[PDB]
Amino acid sequence: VKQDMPPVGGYGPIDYKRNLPRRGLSGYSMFAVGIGALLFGYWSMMRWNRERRRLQIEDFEARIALMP
């Protein structure tokens, strides 16, 4: 009998592919998302700014009527 170490029954395949799935989407979608979220933030910032303008005018009314 012989007791070397051959490949017992053959070994299966071994990959060597450059498998890069390319996660993400196209860049035009990235520009669309960026400009959309940016403009969303601009509109919300505009609304909050003019609300605080209203309250700032009310504080001006306080300092005007409080003075004499």
Partner 1 sequence: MFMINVLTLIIPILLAVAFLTLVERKVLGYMQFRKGPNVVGPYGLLQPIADAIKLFIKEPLRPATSSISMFILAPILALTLALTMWIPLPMPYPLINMNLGVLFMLAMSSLAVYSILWSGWASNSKYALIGALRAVAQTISYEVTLAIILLSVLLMNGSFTLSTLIITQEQVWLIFPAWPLAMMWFISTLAETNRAPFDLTAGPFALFFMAEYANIIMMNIFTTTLFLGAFHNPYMPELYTINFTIKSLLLSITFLWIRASYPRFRYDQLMHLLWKNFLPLTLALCMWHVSLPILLSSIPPQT
Interaction pattern, residues 3-42, with partner 1; x per rule: CB under 8 A: -------------------------------x--xx-xxx
The single residue among 18, 22, 23, 50 that binds partner 1, judged by CB under 8 A, is 50
- Output b/e per residue, 28-40; b: 16+ Cβ within 10 A: eeeeeeeeeeeee
CA 31 to chain centre: 12
As measured in angstroms, the least distance from the Cβ of 68 to partner 1 is 22
CB 47, min distance to partner 1, A: 8
Backbone torsions φ then ψ of 33, nearest 5 degrees: -65, -45
